[PDB]
Write a protein that binds this ligand. Sequence first.
Ligand SMILES: CC(C)(C)S(=O)(=O)c1cc2c(Nc3ccc4scnc4c3)ncnc2cc1OCCOP(=O)(O)O
Ligand SMILES: CC(C)(C)S(=O)(=O)c1cc2c(Nc3ccc4scnc4c3)ncnc2cc1OCCOP(=O)(O)O
Ligand SMILES: [Ca+2]
Lengths: 281, 284
Amino acid sequence: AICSALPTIPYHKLADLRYLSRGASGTVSSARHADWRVQVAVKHLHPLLDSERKDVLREAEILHKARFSYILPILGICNEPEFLGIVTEYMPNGSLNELLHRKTEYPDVAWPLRFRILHEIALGVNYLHNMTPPLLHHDLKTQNILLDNEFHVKIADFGLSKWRMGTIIYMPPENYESIKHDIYSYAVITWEVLSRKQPFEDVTNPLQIMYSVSQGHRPVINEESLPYDIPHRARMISLIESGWAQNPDERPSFLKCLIELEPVLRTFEEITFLEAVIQLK
Amino acid sequence: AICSALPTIPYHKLADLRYLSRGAGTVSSARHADWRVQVAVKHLHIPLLDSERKDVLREAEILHKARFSYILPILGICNEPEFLGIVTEYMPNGSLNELLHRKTEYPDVAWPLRFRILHEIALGVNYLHNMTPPLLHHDLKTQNILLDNEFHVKIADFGLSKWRMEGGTIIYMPPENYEPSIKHDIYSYAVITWEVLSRKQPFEDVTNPLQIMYSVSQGHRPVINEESLPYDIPHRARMISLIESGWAQNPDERPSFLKCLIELEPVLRTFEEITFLEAVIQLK
Ligand SMILES: CC(C)(C)S(=O)(=O)c1cc2c(Nc3ccc4scnc4c3)ncnc2cc1OCCOP(=O)(O)O
Ligand SMILES: CC(C)(C)S(=O)(=O)c1cc2c(Nc3ccc4scnc4c3)ncnc2cc1OCCOP(=O)(O)O
Ligand SMILES: [Ca+2]
């Protein structure tokens, strides 16, 4: 019956508070804890509403309960009449979205690192699904896979997460009008990691995406999207195709997904991961 | 308020249970059958005394409560009539002790990494001291500073730790702790700093540890000279000053970890980011 309380952080302890980004989830700022002498990230509201207050506390409780090696570590809650935010560790290398799509900043993203990121996303989500009761993330995207100083994964944005009791490109078609949601989002992420392409890039209207996916269309699998030189290409296409299956029942569990990925990750020597990171800006 | 429960891990979920080391308990590596991750298990030497049981659950609770970036992350408690242990993340690069003293395996341990390790030990301990009530480690040693895949620090062994409200080595113990304090950890930290910068065993020339205690109680400390600490150590003067104030005979004259961090922050900024990655690739 061992319990841990989430610390409360007085707002005045957050020095050098500097805006990072703004989204549907909230505003993100970087700061430094005055006493802990560490860099932190604060996901705050930035006009006060008590409905938004309950949302932030809900997210903070989920993150506190869901602590694991591949989940964004929550450091405390900053709860004041003036300000409200979730204080977490600062991820110096940002998101998987930027790593994949900022091609001038990152001309090369070595295969070992790409596969390690995919393994760690699967490890993080599997942990969530294995909790009592299971936690389902329900908003996985390359924007929510944060990367620490050594490009290790930290899953963020627990705003839509649910206890099993914006963009639509990662959403399973049955969700337009389930434990099998996250695996679908994961198959799209996998495709995106291996291609460095935006899913449905040639599609201008998101209603056209939604209609196509509802009819069984998926991001294109060919020589141009997934080149023949991808290590374990056949096996990876198989995983992607089972993950984004039209029938949710036919999509694998993250356990099955990990049992498949484990022999692939063992083909890479340990030093090749370190070498991949040192190559990166 | 927001509370988190420490998961309970059935023993049968720990596959490939292999012995790592034994000490004042036993540490084994395993893999979680459902989580598909490598874990470390600090368990009792396989007889189950109810006094030893309370000790494990006490440490498990301290580790759960003390979660931070530089503290060994607890994953769960394995509590069964058959077996009892603390399940944590596996630290693939072992301890600071091995890094420093396994000189054939590691001929060079670059200065940036050494300073980063010292910064992270100070960050970890400072966090403990800043809790309400403060947590005091009371058993810091190079054997208890574990190193992850990229040689980032994780402080372990909370067995002697306390809330400010048989064993081994005494070389990190302040002389006032000998016979029957918030200033204990800073003393252990000064010895660790000396050890990191020298790659030498404190009081190497002294065969008997009781002779060490007699020496320390008299005001003797590990030697500070050209041979122990060469003149080519980056920020040598500043570091000697930190070490000497940290292990002072008078506890009142020892700095807080905050003061220690405020001093170390400008030193760590002198090193370029790539030098930390380079230091780690050299060690592989
Ligand atoms: C995602 C991004 C790269 C556009 S960012 O917003 O600039 C960013 C976000 C961070 C974060 N976000 C967070 C914090 C708390 C919670 S509670 C649930 N979900 C969250 C998410 N957390 C940690 N570190 C972050 C770092 C970020 O960017 C890195 C800085 O980029 P740069 O200025 O280019 O060096
Ligand atoms: C310290 C060592 C290197 C001699 S080790 O014993 O081989 C070791 C220990 C680990 C650990 N210890 C632990 C576990 C749980 C608790 S609860 C409070 N304190 C602790 C401390 N935890 C995590 N990883 C460890 C890794 C260790 O070995 C390094 C790798 O050795 P090898 O497999 O031979 O390469
Ligand atoms: Ca070597």
